[PDB]
Amino acid sequence: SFINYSSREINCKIVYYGPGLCGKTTNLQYIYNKTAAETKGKLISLSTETDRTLFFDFLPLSLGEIRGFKTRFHLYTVPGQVFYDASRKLILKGVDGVVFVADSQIERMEANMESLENLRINLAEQGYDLNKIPYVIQYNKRDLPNAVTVEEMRKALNHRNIPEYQAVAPTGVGVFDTLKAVAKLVLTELK
Amino acid sequence: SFINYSSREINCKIVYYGPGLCGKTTNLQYIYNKTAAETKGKLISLSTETDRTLFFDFLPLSLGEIRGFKTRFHLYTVPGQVFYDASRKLILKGVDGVVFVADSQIERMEANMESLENLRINLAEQGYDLNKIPYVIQYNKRDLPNAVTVEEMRKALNHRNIPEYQAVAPTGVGVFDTLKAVAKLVLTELK
Ligand SMILES: Nc1nc2c(ncn2[C@@H]2O[C@H](COP(=O)(O)OP(=O)(O)O)[C@@H](O)[C@H]2O)c(=O)[nH]1
Ligand SMILES: Nc1nc2c(ncn2[C@@H]2O[C@H](COP(=O)(O)OP(=O)(O)O)[C@@H](O)[C@H]2O)c(=O)[nH]1
């Protein structure tokens, strides 16, 4: 979404979205911890009285070039409990790709559906269509005993059959598979 | 230091500098709390594993214009204990004015002198001269019984006789006088 014509880099924004405490910070921290130090910037936590943000950027060395430009990935999330919907509206500004992180716990299903509809509403207000943008869903907390089946989560949250990944974010299970999937969809859009 | 030609604003950066726990957050919070809501942005706290930052901006209504441009002030500080000198080097990037906040406690005099010399060294590395830049010193914690006299602080920290203010930052004593002094010196440089 942002071209740096001098440093010859395409900057793209990947937003991790989902209900409070679903595992968005965990995904970003795990990715950050496993990313080579020379390819990434700092892990930045931003806080105000009203809102919170967690983000970082990285330039993967493995990737080629799109018309002589290298692609830099910026991973953004609104962590924890959200008190103002404005922060979820702000996080989506200039989004290139979205990872919806669903909390697999039975007690968080209503929250997952509320957040997924909130994502659709906030994207539409900015001229983005959730059915057309690079978008992947992660069924997080697969380790917990109170987790709903993959079939129940698919039926409730993935009617359009978009890429889905089962994860246990603290151990990194499914974390890089979710990231690689949305990043590939973003690169295809850029090409 | 940054001209916004479209919004017709001169943006200037004021850095509060001094040893850890000297009263820099207190100064910024007191100023922020007494600034009219319609003239300021959010009070932003930034944190990484290595460093911390506290900042906000405000456009005072009382001020006139410099060649049809309004002046917006950005107040920046590295709060708390500092683990990496790089954060003190980074905070000074694009600085227009500096407030050195000295902790008046006897046990913090060595820290004040170390920090003041560190400010001089970090400014020189970026091509700034501490003897030429808008710079004011604040003798904070004047309320404490273990406070050194104003004469002892002047002798140890103000050999060049630059503007000095006695403060008790939590009660706001000397806080706006310190700010108005450095801001006036910045405005003269801009004119
Ligand atoms: N059991 C389990 N706990 C998880 C998982 N993902 C995150 N958590 C925990 O859930 C809590 C909230 O997660 P966090 O990443 O901070 O949520 P965020 O608000 O979406 O950023 C923390 O205690 C995490 O360790 C998971 O896959 N399994
Ligand atoms: N007694 C007294 N305490 C102060 C004064 N200024 C700051 N403090 C206290 O010193 C501690 C550290 O101050 P803080 O502003 O957070 O320091 P910073 O690290 O420079 O940002 C806090 O407990 C403050 O309330 C002062 O003028 N007098």
From Swiss-Prot, chains A, B:
It comes from the Bacteria. Keywords: Coiled coil, Cytoplasm, GTP-binding, Nucleotide-binding. Residues 98-127 form a coiled coil. GO terms for molecular function: GTP binding; GTPase activity. Gene3D superfamilies: P-loop containing nucleotide triphosphate hydrolases. The lineage of its organism: Bacteria, Pseudomonadati, Myxococcota, Myxococcia, Myxococcales. GTP binds at residues 18-25, 77-81, 140-143. One of its GO terms (cellular component) is cytoplasm. Disulfide bonds: none annotated. This is Mutual gliding-motility protein MglA. It holds the Pfam family Arf. The keyword Acetylation does not apply. Interacts with MasK and AglZ. Belongs to the small GTPase superfamily. Arf family. MglA subfamily. It is found in: Cytoplasm.
